[PDB]
Design a binder for these strands. Structure first.
Ligand SMILES: [Mg+2]
Ligand SMILES: [Mg+2]
Lengths: 144, 116, 64, 204
RNA sequence: AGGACGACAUUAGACGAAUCAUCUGGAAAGAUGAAUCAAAGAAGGUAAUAAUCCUGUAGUCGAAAAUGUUGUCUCUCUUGA
RNA sequence: GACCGAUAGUGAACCAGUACCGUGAGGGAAAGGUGAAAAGCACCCCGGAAGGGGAGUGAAAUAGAACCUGAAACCGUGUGCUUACAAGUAGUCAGAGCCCGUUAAUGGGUGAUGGCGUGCCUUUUGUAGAAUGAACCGGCGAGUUACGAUUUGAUGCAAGGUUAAGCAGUAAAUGUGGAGCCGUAGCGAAAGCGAGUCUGAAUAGGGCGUUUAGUAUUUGGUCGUAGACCCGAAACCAGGUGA
RNA sequence: GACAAUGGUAGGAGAGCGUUCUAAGGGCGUUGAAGCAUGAUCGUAAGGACAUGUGGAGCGCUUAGAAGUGAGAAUGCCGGU
């Protein structure tokens, strides 16, 4: 009932309060050590700062650019098309709605990693070279 | 919620002062002075449980030594024979025999000289 | 506030498919007559940011 | 789902249960959908001053070197008698979400603890013309119901819930207004037949 | 760009159900007994801890008047492709 | 109201920005409680009066306006043991002699004589240190919360997980809301190619990959932006008040 | 039931007592609560009761939650001596 509640076994935990004793360990110096910079209130230096020596990222050269346009295609293997059972046409108004492709960026590419094991009418924006052969083995179609 | 400092600084600073009654002057009244005498009176007692066991042996050996010299024997000739003549078990707290019954302590001295 | 990516390090570094970074070798700017042909050729392949220096830059590259 | 009652009675005893009243209840979810509800009722209006909110205290109190007593900076500091509170309460908020597969498992572990314990009772649709609590206390006495019951009805009629407000223990919630803290607060559950088909149509 | 006739809201206010007797006490609201009201068991006070003693709450009820919010009634004004 | 309860919460529960400090701008505290009802002590007695002690009111004045409970420091009066030939961080362990009698257990107070024994923190290669700090007693007085990041523990589903703002709902924690995000496929500076790809005349050889578990909320650790454990400067700038 | 381990400052890990507050179940209280005072008691430690005195109305226990959660020192701050 409600007058007797137990948490999940191993789920909960106490928390360390520092500076509140001498035999709890974290006491009279709170787990920082003696004097220095990083035992001051708010000390500790910024990350990736070696100390005055020039850092890692000012010792390597820059490399590359963007290509502002940059098409991106969504991947469907051939192993993911055994989910469609009975002679089904594979349409972008169907290949999204089941749950194979979620939230595509541009048109669907059909790569070849698995096998179809079923004849299928397949329409896709770009096939690959090895996946437009295992469709032709079972007997299928194409459209770009 | 504001946890006010309640009645735990009463009680924690009584059960140190009440351990420290019988001390001179201010070492039984003030907190800070009777605190740090309680930390030393449980430290002196810790090396005085270990020292008590070996300073009652510096007394039993003194009585046995003042018992064999009137029978004209040393102490070091007495706890030699009683390991070697007999297998009289090593005991020095039982120098109570020499105090109580001198007639009882005499036959041991007979048995020590007998096989040494 | 949410953490800002160190922009001077995202220009120099890619992210691979095991978490480990990728960089380009130094000394590739000038003075190529003071370097051997067995040395100017092997400052060209790319390597990985070391196990030591990955301990320092865990927070600065969080959205890569 | 035992049989039925009207006031000492029986009828067509509905039995078509589902995974709503029968699943073995986990307690790791049922403990953690109470804390999500019990720690969201707190409004958290509580605050305190800091060093920058107290009135005054900008002049240095003339104590730097050459006075023989301690170095002091303001007369409003946490050492000092007056204001300045270091790490006090702030006006914050206490709520968190949880997955929708884990908020539906909770009611399948609080209804499921009522039929293991015979703490469920289905009645027919009772009609009160005018609300009278004296008319309603004659009902729960002969129904043999405990000190604290949860009355489930389908839709909030304006004559059922107006009775049984001053009966200590009795709360009247509609079918889609069920909680988790309510069900583990009751002792036996009383559902109408028109609503036992309704809370089960939501979940099973 | 210049008015009336009553609807509703605000600033006073009214009604508003039901507990009696003993024990300890300086005192009953307390424990032990019997009763009751409940669209009312929120809260405060009363010689201690009151659903039934008081002020009240759920609910109804109320404007001589002065503002305020809108309905339709005027009243001003107007050519449409 | 899982906010405070008179050193708290407003500076202020008391007739507070008021006593008081400053030429001036400006700075700024201290204060609460008789009892259910004033029934607030008629009259006698010592006193110049205060203040007392009886008698009286009251449940109680051992609640009398120094007015609820009344801690410690510090000053007193009484009494069982003890001390005027001794060199004491004041205790400890061994122990005669004396006066007592508890939460009943191999008890309590006191201490002639013997052994050992140079206080507590903080900073140090190292403190009895003649290095630092505290007169004493009492209160107050320092790793906190937010929005992100990453790892660990739990739990729900699992090639799939999950919603954000919003709208309905008791400042209800629960129904709708799939915009969005992370995964399922990497590689290259980029075109691109894709279980492979880039460098290269050349898979010839090497770089990073491939034959699998993720995701959403939360317990703890730590890191980042915020004053970020608390206390303390010399000084910089902006309006203003003063010969 | 054998054989084993157990000095420790910086620091890492584990396991617990206590304080104010809230929710739920049960309970003591004017035939006297909290608080304070004395005592020769109980647990491996922080800490828990109980027995007379003063006190005059509110408080503990079991499981879980949340912290303004623990004082011997800062030439610390106000009050007393
Ligand atoms: Mg000296
Ligand atoms: Mg002049």
């Amino acid at each position: 009932k409600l007058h007797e509640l137990k948490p999940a076994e191993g789920s909960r935990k106490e928390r360390n309060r520092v500076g509140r004793g001498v035999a709890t360990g974290n006491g009279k110096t709170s787990g920082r050590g003696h004097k220095g910079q990083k035992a001051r209130s708010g000390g500790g230096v910024r990350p990736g700062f070696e100390g005055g020596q020039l850092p890692l990222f000012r010792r390597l050269p820059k490399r590359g650019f963007t290509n502002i346009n940059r098409k991106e295609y969504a991947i469907v293997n051939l192993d993911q098309l055994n989910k469609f059972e009975d002679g089904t046409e594979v349409t972008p108004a169907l290949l999204v709605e089941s749950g194979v492709v979620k939230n595509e960026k541009s048109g669907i590419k059909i790569l070849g990693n698995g096998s179809l094991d079923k004849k299928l009418t397949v329409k896709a924006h770009k096939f690959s070279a090895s996946a437009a052969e295992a469709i032709d083995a079972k007997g299928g179609a194409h459209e770009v | 919620p504001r946890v006010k400092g309640g009645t735990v600084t009463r009680a924690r600073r009584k059960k140190t002062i009440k351990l420290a009654k019988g001390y001179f002057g201010s070492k039984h009244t003030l907190y800070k002075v009777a605190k740090q005498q309680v930390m030393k009176s449980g430290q002196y007692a810790f090396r005085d449980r270990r020292q008590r066991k070996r300073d009652f042996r510096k007394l039993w050996i003194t009585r046995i030594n003042a018992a064999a010299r009137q029978h004209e024997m040393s102490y070091s000739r007495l706890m030699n024979g009683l390991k070697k003549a007999g297998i009289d078990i090593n005991r020095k707290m039982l120098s109570e025999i020499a105090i109580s019954d001198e007639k009882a302590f005499a036959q041991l001295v007979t048995k020590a000289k007998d096989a040494l | 506030p949410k953490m800002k990516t160190h922009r001077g390090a995202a220009k120099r570094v890619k992210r691979t498919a095991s978490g480990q970074l990728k960089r380009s070798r130094a000394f590739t700017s000038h003075l190529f007559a003071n370097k051997s042909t067995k040395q100017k050729r092997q400052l060209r392949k790319a390597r990985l940011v070391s196990k030591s220096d990955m301990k320092r830059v865990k927070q600065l590259l969080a959205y890569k | 789902y035992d049989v039925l009652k009207l006031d000492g009675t029986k009828s067509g005893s509905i039995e078509l249960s589902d995974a709503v009243f029968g699943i073995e209840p986990n307690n790791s979810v049922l403990f953690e959908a109470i804390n999500l509800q019990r720690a969201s009722l707190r409004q958290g209006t509580h605050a305190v001053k800091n060093r920058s909110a107290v009135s005054g205290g900008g002049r240095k109190p003339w104590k730097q070197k050459g006075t023989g007593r301690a170095r002091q900076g303001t007369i409003r500091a946490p050492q000092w008698r007056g204001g300045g509170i270091v790490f006090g309460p702030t006006p914050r908020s206490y709520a968190y979400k949880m997955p929708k597969k884990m908020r539906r498992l909770a009611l399948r572990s609080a209804l499921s603890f009522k039929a293991q314990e015979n703490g469920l009772t289905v009645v027919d649709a009772f009609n009160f013309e005018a609300p009278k609590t004296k008319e309603f206390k004659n009902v729960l006495s002969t129904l043999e119901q405990p000190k604290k019951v949860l009355v489930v009805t389908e839709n909030e009629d304006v004559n059922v819930e107006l009775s049984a407000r001053n009966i200590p223990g009795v709360q009247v919630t509609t079918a889609q207004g069920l909680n988790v803290l309510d069900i583990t607060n009751a002792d036996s559950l009383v559902i109408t037949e028109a609503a036992a088909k309704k809370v089960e149509e939501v979940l099973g």
